[PDB]
Each structure stands twice: as structure tokens, then as C-alpha cells.
């Protein structure tokens, strides 16, 4: 359970280190520094306006941005569910 | 489990083949080619602005578009949940 | 399981018969007829722009509209989850 | 089960007492009184436009507003899921 959380935080930090680098210069209010990234990736992970509000405007400059966001969503949303179930079982 | 994923990908491809054909010419930014469709249907499956952002504008041109999106939502959202639970069970 | 679905459809029809009557004349594109209502209540049940997009503009004319939408959300979202789990178990 | 609901209502009231105080004067339509707060925190708990619609505009005046909303989300969303599962188990 704590092991699941450990994976998720490593993933969340690596995702935010990558996101800062990729879309930081072009989208500063969303990924203009590691912290700005960690917030936006938490927002993306919750699915609040992930596509219409973030990923589509991102794709208008970086057309393949989907190769990073969609897998990230698939991976982080599975982990969160897995974790939340793990606490409930334990 | 892998069988559940196999169903979902077939559904996802058939849904995107259908969606391209139906609302492609009228809504090119959303379904203007199989890939554009696969992205928008993933977005619809996650429920991000499915109605206010996609389905309602689509219905303003195709008033019965709901006969395709609502069942798709019902089917894909059930499958994803069923799949995610299936992995969790098959690990215990 | 089929019993759960039966409850939900009765609730969904009564909710749409009530919604048509309450906010139909004031918000025709959302509840201007039983079918328009059934669509918007499905949208509300999925939580797509339920508050910012629907319930807040509804409350600007009917300030207590929350006494209908919030319980409806609580009830329908519980039922859907209960149903989806029921199919998975059976 | 009823104990889980009891925790959530205490949390929900304390969160709305805090939220009223913090962002009430600056964002009156959202937290301008305990009731306005309880509605917006329910909306945040459901995740409807939590960030783009609420938290980001809030952060433009209070840059650390995230220290309150993100933990609240983490805590309330876990509780609701835990509660909904608890009813389902206590019926079997
Ligand atoms: C696993 C969940 C991880 C959640 C991570 C939250 C990070 C929040 C990011 C953040 O602190 N800011 C960026 C977003 O505005 C604001 C700051 O930059 C500012 O307050 C001081 O600097
Ligand atoms: C499971 C569902 C997976 C869905 C993946 C869809 C990917 C769609 C896509 O690649 N594009 C359409 C959306 O813009 C962008 C391309 O057109 C662009 O990369 C070429 O340039
Ligand atoms: C339990 C799930 C229930 C889902 C119910 C879906 C109802 C869809 C409503 C609907 O058909 N329309 C209203 C929304 O536009 C369009 C029609 O009015 C028009 O096509 C013919 O009339
Ligand atoms: C569990 C969470 C329950 C939350 C219920 C909040 C209800 C808030 C509310 O009643 N209003 C604030 C939102 O507008 C409207 C009133 O101000 C209006 O009815 C008086 O007129
Ligand atoms: Na949403
Ligand atoms: Na959601």
C-alpha cells in the first residue's frame, strides 16, 4: 500500500520533471517550473479539463503531446484506484 | 483480463471508424480522421467535457448523435472499470 | 442487479418528469421537454459541467435548485456504482 | 458506515468554515458565506471544474490555495469512495 504510494510519487515527480522540460517554454502557466507542472499533472490525473482545457491547446504547438498525457492518465488513474482500494482492503 | 482489453480495443476502433464517418465532415477538429476520432472518443470515455464540449455542439447539426455517444459511454466506462478491477483481482 | 437497473430507470424518469416541470420554462435548452431533461440529467449524473455549466446558471433564477440536483447526484451516482459492481460480482 | 458519514460531515463543515474565512472576501460568489462554501466544496469534491473553474482563479489572489484544496480533494474523495463501498459491503 505504502509501496504503491512510493511508485506514484516517483512517477509524479519524473512526469513533472519531463513535463517542465517539454511544454514549459511554450505553456508557462501550466508547466513553466517543476511545481507549476506537479499542479497541472495532478489536475490532469483528476481529469479536470485535461483535454479541452490543457492537452488540445498543448497539441496545437506539440501535435504528439498525446503520447505523454494519455499514457500518464492510463498509468496514474490506475495507480490511484489501486491505492484507494488497497487502503480499504488493509 | 487481456480478453477484456482486446474487446475494448476492437470497440474503440469500430467506434472511431463509425465516428469518423458520421461527424467527420461536419466536426473536422474532433472526428476529421480515424486518429482525431480515437483521441476524442478517449476524451469522451474519460467524460472530459463530453456533453457541453462535444455532444451538444454535435447534436446541433446531428440531433440524434446521443444514440451513439450515450451507449458508447455506458459500454466503454463499464469495460474500463471492469478491466481495472480485473487486474487488481488477478494480482491477489 | 436487474432490480437495481429497474429502480434507476424509474428514478431517472421521475427526476426528468420533475426537472421538465421545474426548470423547463426558464431553461428550455436543458429541460424544455421530458427528453431534453433525460439527456441533461444523464449529463448531470456523469458530472460533466454539472455545477459550473448547469446548476449555477439554474440557481441564478431558482436559488434553491440545489435541493433537487445535489440529492439526485448523491442517489444516481451511488446507484450506478452499486449496479456496475453488481454486474462485476455476478 | 454511519461513522464514516459522520467524519465526512464534520470535515465538510470545518472545510466550509475555513473556506468562508479564507477566500470569502476575495471570491464572494464561491465562499461568501458558509452555505455558498458548502456548495462550492461539494462541487470541488465531485471535481467539476475544480482547478480551471475554481482553484486557479483562487490562486491568482492566494498563490498557496492549493495547500487547502488538494489535501481536501485527497481526503474527501477517499472518504466518499470508502463510504460508498462500505454501504455495498454492509448490504451483503
Ligand atoms: C501527488 C500530488 C502532488 C501535488 C503537487 C502540488 C504542487 C503545487 C504547486 C505549487 O506550489 N504552485 C504552482 C501552481 O500554481 C504554486 C507555487 O509555485 C507558489 O505557491 C510558491 O512558489
Ligand atoms: C486508447 C485511445 C488512444 C487514442 C490515441 C489517438 C491519437 C491521435 C493522434 O495521434 N492525433 C489526433 C489528435 O490531434 C494527432 C496526429 O494527427 C498527429 O500526431 C500527427 O501530426
Ligand atoms: C438512463 C439514461 C437515459 C438517457 C436518455 C437520453 C435521452 C435523449 C434525449 C433526446 O433524444 N433528445 C433531447 C436532447 O437533445 C433529442 C430529441 O429531442 C430529438 O432527437 C428527437 O425529438
Ligand atoms: C453535502 C454538501 C451539501 C451542500 C449544500 C449547500 C447549500 C448552499 C445553498 O443553499 N446556497 C448557496 C449556493 O448558492 C443557496 C442559498 O444562499 C439560497 O438557497 C438562499 O436563497
Ligand atoms: Na468532469
Ligand atoms: Na469525473
Author numbering:
A (entry chain B), C (entry chain B): 131 to 220
B (entry chain A), D (entry chain A): 131 to 222
Quote the study's own text:
As with the eukaryotic channels, their S1–S4 segments form the voltage sensors, and the S5–S6 segments from each polypeptide chain associate to form an eight‐helix bundle that constitutes the pore. The selectivity filter (SF), which determines the channel's Na+ permeability over other cations, is formed by the close association of the P loops from each of the polypeptide chains.
This mutation changes the residue near the NaI site from a glutamic acid to the shorter aspartic acid, but does not alter the net charge of the SF. The crystal structure of the E178D mutant showed considerable differences from the wild‐type channel local to the site of the mutation: the methylene group of the glutamic acid was missing, producing a side chain that projected to a lesser extent into the SF, as expected, and the site at NaI was completely devoid of ordered electron density, suggesting that it was unoccupied by an ion. The alteration in the protein structure caused by removal of the methylene group of E178 exposes a positive region of the polypeptide backbone adjacent to the site where the top sodium ion is located in the wild‐type protein; this likely contributes to why an equivalent sodium ion is not seen adjacent to this position in the mutant. Relative to wild‐type, the mutant has a more electropositive region (denoted by the circle in Fig 3B right) at the top of the SF, due to the exposure of the backbone nitrogen of residue S179 when the longer side chain of residue E178 is replaced with the shorter side chain in the mutant; this could tend to inhibit cations from binding at this site, consistent with measured decreased current densities. The current density of the E178D mutant channel was 15‐times less than that found in the wild‐type channel measured under sodium‐only conditions (11.4 ± 3 vs. 165 ± 21 pA/pF). As the structure demonstrates that there is one less binding site in the mutant channel than in the wild‐type structure, this could be consistent with fewer ions passing through the channel per unit of time, and therefore a lower current density. K+, Ca2+ and Ba2+ conductances were detected (albeit at lower levels) in addition to Na+ and Li+.
